[PDB]
C-alpha cells in the first residue's frame, strides 16, 4: 500500500541548508516501520543518511551527525531531511524509503551558479536517418543547469522506440543530451512529432516540433 515521493529544491548554494521532503501515501508514518533517507552520488555510490521510526525516534549516520536533522509532520504524513553547511560533495539523488519501498528520488545539486533552462533544437528525419521503412528523428536539449531534464514525445503518447541519452557535462559547465525515436518512415508526411522538455529547476517547459527536412 505504501507509496513514497520526494520533493525539494534542485539547486542549493554552498554553505546553505539543503531540505528534502518525503510525502507518504497509503499508510501512516506513525503506525510502524523506519522511514529512511538515502542518497546516491554521481559516482553511483549509495549512502544511508538516517531514519525516523514510527515512534519519532531518529538515527543519524555518524559521518553526517553534526549537520543533520530528520523531522516529521504527522498531520501531513510527511518526513523531512535537513542537511546544513552543504558543499558540492552533497550533490546527489535523495531517496526516501521504508524497509521495502523506495521513492524515485529527487536530484539536488550544490553550486553557486544560477539555473539555466535548455534550448531545444530539432534533429530532423531525412534520407540520411531512414532505412528499410524505419526513420529516426529527435531533439537536441542543450545548455541547461542543473540536472535533470525530463523528455517526453507527443505529450507522453509516444514511448515506443524512444531513447533519451544520459546527459553529458559540456566544457562550458552546462549539460546537454539528445532524445531520439525510431518511427515508421511512412508516417513522416502524416504524423506530427513533438518533443516536450521539462526542466523543473528553471521552471522551463519547451515543446519542439520535429519536421522532415524541407530540402
Amino acid at each position: 500500500q505504501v507509496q513514497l515521493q520526494e520533493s525539494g529544491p534542485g539547486l542549493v548554494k554552498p554553505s546553505e541548508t539543503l531540505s528534502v521532503t518525503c510525502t507518504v501515501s497509503g499508510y501512516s508514518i506513525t503506525s510502524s516501520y523506519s522511514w529512511n533517507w538515502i542518497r546516491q552520488f554521481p559516482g553511483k555510490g549509495l549512502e544511508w543518511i538516517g531514519n525516523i521510526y514510527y515512534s519519532g525516534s531518529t538515527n543519524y549516520n555518524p559521518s553526517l551527525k553534526s549537520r543533520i536533522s530528520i523531522s516529521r509532520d504527522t498531520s501531513k504524513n510527511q518526513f523531512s531531511l535537513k542537511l546544513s553547511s552543504v558543499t558540492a560533495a552533497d550533490t546527489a539523488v535523495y531517496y526516501c524509503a521504508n524497509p521495502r519501498v523506495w521513492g524515485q528520488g529527487t536530484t539536488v545539486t550544490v553550486s553557486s551558479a544560477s539555473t539555466k533552462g535548455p534550448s531545444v533544437f530539432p534533429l530532423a528525419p531525412s534520407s540520411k536517418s531512414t532505412s528499410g521503412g524505419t526513420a529516426a528523428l529527435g531533439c537536441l536539449v542543450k545548455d541547461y543547469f542543473p540536472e535533470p531534464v525530463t523528455v517526453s514525445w507527443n505529450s507522453g503518447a509516444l514511448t515506443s522506440g524512444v531513447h533519451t541519452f544520459p546527459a553529458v557535462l559540456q566544457s562550458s559547465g552546462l549539460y546537454s543530451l539528445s532524445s531520439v525515436v525510431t518511427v515508421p518512415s511512412s508516417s513522416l508526411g502524416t504524423q506530427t512529432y513533438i518533443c516536450n522538455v521539462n526542466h523543473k529547476p528553471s521552471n522551463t517547459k519547451v515543446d519542439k516540433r520535429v519536421e522532415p527536412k524541407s530540402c
Binding site: 544511508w48 549516520n61 521495502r100 536517418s129
Partner: protein
Amino acid sequence: DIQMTQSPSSLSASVGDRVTITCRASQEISGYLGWLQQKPGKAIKRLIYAASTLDSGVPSRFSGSRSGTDFTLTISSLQPEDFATYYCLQYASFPRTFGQGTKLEIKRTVAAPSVFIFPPSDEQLKSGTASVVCLLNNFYPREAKVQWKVDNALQSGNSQESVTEQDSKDSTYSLSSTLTLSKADYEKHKVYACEVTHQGLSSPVTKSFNRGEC
C-alpha cells in the same frame, strides 16, 4: 563502521547463465542483509531480506544465501531484463551500510549498429554554434568507435559520446556522438562525416552530408 565489501564490480553473462555476487561483512551481522536491484528509470527495488527471504513477486531465479560473514546473491537462468546494478545492504547495526554495487550486463549475439546522421538545425545556426549528431542504433557489444571527419580531416577534442543503458528486451545499446563546431568553422567546410567501427562491422561505415544542400 560495519563495512560491506562487494565483488565483482561488474559482470557480463549470457541468457540462461548463472552469476554469483558476493558481499563480505567486516564483522558479524547475523543474517541482517538485504539485496537491492537498480534498473534504469525505475525506483530501487528490494529483492531479498534477512539474507535468504525472497520478496513476493521476485522470480525464483534470484537466490540469497550466507556462510558466516560471506553473503551471496546467485542469479540463475539470467534473462535480458536482469540488466541492473545490484547492491547489498546490512542493517545489523547503525549506520546501515551498502556494498559498492555490481553492474550486470546481459550478453547476446554480436549485432552491428545502423548509423544515422543529423545536420544542425536552421534554428541552432542562428546562434554561434553548430552541433552535428551521429546516431548508432541497436548494437552489441557496447564498445564502438566514432570518428568525425570534416572535409576529410580527422577531428579530435570537439565531440562527446553518450550511450543508453542496455535495452531490457533485445539487450542492445544505442549511442549518440555529438560534434560541436563554431558556426564560423561550420560554414567554411562542405563534407561532414561520421565513420563508425564496431566488432560486427567488417569495414567502417561512413554516413555523410554536404552543408547547405537543398
